[PDB]
Design an enzyme around this catalytic site. Sequence first.
Site, PDB file in Angstrom:
ATOM      1  N   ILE A   5      -3.150  -4.530 -16.247  1.00  0.00           N
ATOM      2  CA  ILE A   5      -3.616  -3.253 -16.775  1.00  0.00           C
ATOM      3  C   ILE A   5      -2.446  -2.253 -16.710  1.00  0.00           C
ATOM      4  O   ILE A   5      -1.814  -2.122 -15.661  1.00  0.00           O
ATOM      5  CB  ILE A   5      -4.762  -2.681 -15.894  1.00  0.00           C
ATOM      6  CG1 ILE A   5      -5.840  -3.740 -15.604  1.00  0.00           C
ATOM      7  CG2 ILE A   5      -5.381  -1.429 -16.519  1.00  0.00           C
ATOM      8  CD1 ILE A   5      -6.378  -4.364 -16.860  1.00  0.00           C
ATOM      9  N   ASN A   6      -2.154  -1.544 -17.799  1.00  0.00           N
ATOM     10  CA  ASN A   6      -1.067  -0.557 -17.792  1.00  0.00           C
ATOM     11  C   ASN A   6      -1.562   0.874 -17.693  1.00  0.00           C
ATOM     12  O   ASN A   6      -2.549   1.234 -18.334  1.00  0.00           O
ATOM     13  CB  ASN A   6      -0.255  -0.652 -19.083  1.00  0.00           C
ATOM     14  CG  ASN A   6       0.179  -2.047 -19.379  1.00  0.00           C
ATOM     15  OD1 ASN A   6       1.144  -2.547 -18.806  1.00  0.00           O
ATOM     16  ND2 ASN A   6      -0.540  -2.707 -20.281  1.00  0.00           N
ATOM     17  N   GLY A  11       2.112  12.363 -19.315  1.00  0.00           N
ATOM     18  CA  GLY A  11       1.066  12.879 -20.222  1.00  0.00           C
ATOM     19  C   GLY A  11      -0.360  12.416 -19.918  1.00  0.00           C
ATOM     20  O   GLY A  11      -1.240  12.506 -20.783  1.00  0.00           O
ATOM     21  N   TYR A  76      -7.656  -4.589  -2.620  1.00  0.00           N
ATOM     22  CA  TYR A  76      -6.537  -4.255  -1.737  1.00  0.00           C
ATOM     23  C   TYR A  76      -5.191  -4.459  -2.451  1.00  0.00           C
ATOM     24  O   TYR A  76      -4.977  -5.485  -3.122  1.00  0.00           O
ATOM     25  CB  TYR A  76      -6.617  -5.183  -0.539  1.00  0.00           C
ATOM     26  CG  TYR A  76      -5.840  -4.778   0.699  1.00  0.00           C
ATOM     27  CD1 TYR A  76      -4.533  -5.198   0.886  1.00  0.00           C
ATOM     28  CD2 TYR A  76      -6.447  -4.020   1.702  1.00  0.00           C
ATOM     29  CE1 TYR A  76      -3.815  -4.855   2.024  1.00  0.00           C
ATOM     30  CE2 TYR A  76      -5.760  -3.678   2.849  1.00  0.00           C
ATOM     31  CZ  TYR A  76      -4.445  -4.101   3.006  1.00  0.00           C
ATOM     32  OH  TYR A  76      -3.753  -3.765   4.124  1.00  0.00           O
ATOM     33  N   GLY A 117      -0.769  -3.301   5.156  1.00  0.00           N
ATOM     34  CA  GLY A 117      -0.955  -2.176   4.243  1.00  0.00           C
ATOM     35  C   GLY A 117      -2.108  -1.269   4.639  1.00  0.00           C
ATOM     36  O   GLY A 117      -2.556  -0.471   3.850  1.00  0.00           O
ATOM     37  N   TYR A 119      -4.112   1.935   6.409  1.00  0.00           N
ATOM     38  CA  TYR A 119      -3.784   3.376   6.464  1.00  0.00           C
ATOM     39  C   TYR A 119      -3.108   3.827   7.762  1.00  0.00           C
ATOM     40  O   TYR A 119      -2.139   4.563   7.739  1.00  0.00           O
ATOM     41  CB  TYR A 119      -5.038   4.230   6.291  1.00  0.00           C
ATOM     42  CG  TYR A 119      -5.520   4.365   4.877  1.00  0.00           C
ATOM     43  CD1 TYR A 119      -4.634   4.606   3.842  1.00  0.00           C
ATOM     44  CD2 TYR A 119      -6.882   4.308   4.592  1.00  0.00           C
ATOM     45  CE1 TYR A 119      -5.082   4.758   2.521  1.00  0.00           C
ATOM     46  CE2 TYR A 119      -7.339   4.460   3.304  1.00  0.00           C
ATOM     47  CZ  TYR A 119      -6.441   4.683   2.273  1.00  0.00           C
ATOM     48  OH  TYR A 119      -6.939   4.844   1.010  1.00  0.00           O
ATOM     49  N   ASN A 137      -1.496  13.921 -10.328  1.00  0.00           N
ATOM     50  CA  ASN A 137      -0.632  13.244 -11.251  1.00  0.00           C
ATOM     51  C   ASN A 137       0.847  13.400 -10.853  1.00  0.00           C
ATOM     52  O   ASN A 137       1.603  12.436 -10.942  1.00  0.00           O
ATOM     53  CB  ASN A 137      -0.862  13.689 -12.701  1.00  0.00           C
ATOM     54  CG  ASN A 137      -0.297  12.665 -13.692  1.00  0.00           C
ATOM     55  OD1 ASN A 137      -0.606  11.466 -13.597  1.00  0.00           O
ATOM     56  ND2 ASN A 137       0.586  13.107 -14.566  1.00  0.00           N
ATOM     57  N   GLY A 138       1.236  14.592 -10.406  1.00  0.00           N
ATOM     58  CA  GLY A 138       2.586  14.802  -9.925  1.00  0.00           C
ATOM     59  C   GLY A 138       2.874  13.842  -8.765  1.00  0.00           C
ATOM     60  O   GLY A 138       3.859  13.122  -8.788  1.00  0.00           O
ATOM     61  N   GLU A 142       5.796  10.773  -8.763  1.00  0.00           N
ATOM     62  CA  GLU A 142       6.867  10.686  -7.771  1.00  0.00           C
ATOM     63  C   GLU A 142       6.777   9.410  -6.949  1.00  0.00           C
ATOM     64  O   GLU A 142       7.798   8.818  -6.623  1.00  0.00           O
ATOM     65  CB  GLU A 142       6.889  11.954  -6.872  1.00  0.00           C
ATOM     66  CG  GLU A 142       7.202  13.221  -7.684  1.00  0.00           C
ATOM     67  CD  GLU A 142       6.492  14.485  -7.179  1.00  0.00           C
ATOM     68  OE1 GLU A 142       6.103  14.561  -6.001  1.00  0.00           O
ATOM     69  OE2 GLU A 142       6.298  15.425  -7.984  1.00  0.00           O
ATOM     70  N   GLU A 173      -8.945   3.239  -4.179  1.00  0.00           N
ATOM     71  CA  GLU A 173     -10.111   4.042  -3.715  1.00  0.00           C
ATOM     72  C   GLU A 173     -10.881   4.661  -4.879  1.00  0.00           C
ATOM     73  O   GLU A 173     -12.108   4.773  -4.840  1.00  0.00           O
ATOM     74  CB  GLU A 173      -9.727   5.134  -2.698  1.00  0.00           C
ATOM     75  CG  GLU A 173      -8.928   4.643  -1.464  1.00  0.00           C
ATOM     76  CD  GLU A 173      -9.780   3.857  -0.480  1.00  0.00           C
ATOM     77  OE1 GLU A 173     -10.834   3.360  -0.897  1.00  0.00           O
ATOM     78  OE2 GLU A 173      -9.398   3.748   0.708  1.00  0.00           O
ATOM     79  N   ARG A 176     -13.047   1.876  -6.299  1.00  0.00           N
ATOM     80  CA  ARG A 176     -14.216   1.644  -5.385  1.00  0.00           C
ATOM     81  C   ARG A 176     -15.296   2.731  -5.478  1.00  0.00           C
ATOM     82  O   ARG A 176     -16.500   2.427  -5.370  1.00  0.00           O
ATOM     83  CB  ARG A 176     -13.756   1.592  -3.921  1.00  0.00           C
ATOM     84  CG  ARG A 176     -12.794   0.428  -3.563  1.00  0.00           C
ATOM     85  CD  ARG A 176     -12.339   0.573  -2.113  1.00  0.00           C
ATOM     86  NE  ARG A 176     -11.576  -0.603  -1.656  1.00  0.00           N
ATOM     87  CZ  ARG A 176     -10.310  -0.540  -1.236  1.00  0.00           C
ATOM     88  NH1 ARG A 176      -9.680   0.641  -1.156  1.00  0.00           N
ATOM     89  NH2 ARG A 176      -9.666  -1.648  -0.870  1.00  0.00           N
ATOM     90  N   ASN A 191      -4.265  19.965 -13.713  1.00  0.00           N
ATOM     91  CA  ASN A 191      -2.883  19.697 -13.333  1.00  0.00           C
ATOM     92  C   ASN A 191      -2.590  20.304 -11.969  1.00  0.00           C
ATOM     93  O   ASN A 191      -1.677  21.109 -11.810  1.00  0.00           O
ATOM     94  CB  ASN A 191      -1.879  20.213 -14.389  1.00  0.00           C
ATOM     95  CG  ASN A 191      -0.464  19.721 -14.122  1.00  0.00           C
ATOM     96  OD1 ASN A 191      -0.275  18.623 -13.576  1.00  0.00           O
ATOM     97  ND2 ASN A 191       0.534  20.524 -14.486  1.00  0.00           N
TER      98      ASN A 191
END
Length: 259
Positions: A5-6, A11, A76, A117, A119, A137-138, A142, A173, A176, A191
């Site tokens: 899945i991409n 944007g 996971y 992996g 938390y 999104n920012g 990053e 998450e 889920r 945003n």
Amino acid sequence: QYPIINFTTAGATVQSYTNFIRAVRGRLTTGADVRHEIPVLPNRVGLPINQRFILVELSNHAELSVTLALDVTNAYVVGYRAGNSAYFFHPDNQEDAEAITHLFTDVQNRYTFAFGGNYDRLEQLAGNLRENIELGNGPLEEAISALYYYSTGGTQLPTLARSFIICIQMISEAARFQYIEGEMRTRIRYNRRSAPDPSVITLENSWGRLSTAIQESNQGAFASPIQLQRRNGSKFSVYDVSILIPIIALMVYRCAPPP
């Protein structure tokens, strides 16, 4: 070759993110096992290795891409590829250790982290709790750059760890929990970035026990209430699957369904 899945954060909109999460859910759930209207992920015992993982390829505005590997049995994130490398969290058992050798087999440099992996481990490596790490999104844009530059030696482990924590929440998450998907949609819509509130953290921490309570319920009624938190940190009890139907999108398999 597992399904891919991409998603690009460049944007991204509420709709493109929603379509993405819906595609991820669609590849996670064979749709075989629904209980109290909530799909259950495939039981690990007996699922063929050829169906074990899905691939999530993330691209960003800097034109960089990484591909995460998700285990369909529990959503996971077990590792990822960037360029000519693949990296995996330390496996929780030989079975899983064996499963992952099937991932990213064409890469040149495979490392298995000595850390898992979870938390608590990531938060220690990152030097920060989930409630202090902004999501949006920012932050995801990053995170993608940070995962990519790790393969080239330009990312430190704290940054790598904080970047996993952002990916795991915005992808696994949100797959889920419709409720977490909704909190991420709101961030994208305006945003904005902000750390997750207590309602998000407590849901994340309660996925397994919510899953068990629903699967062991008597006609949907819990024998023991589960305490969750509101967005302001106050507590409230869940006594029944009905109020979770709009909240939880996928459950992990905890017990066979009763006749």
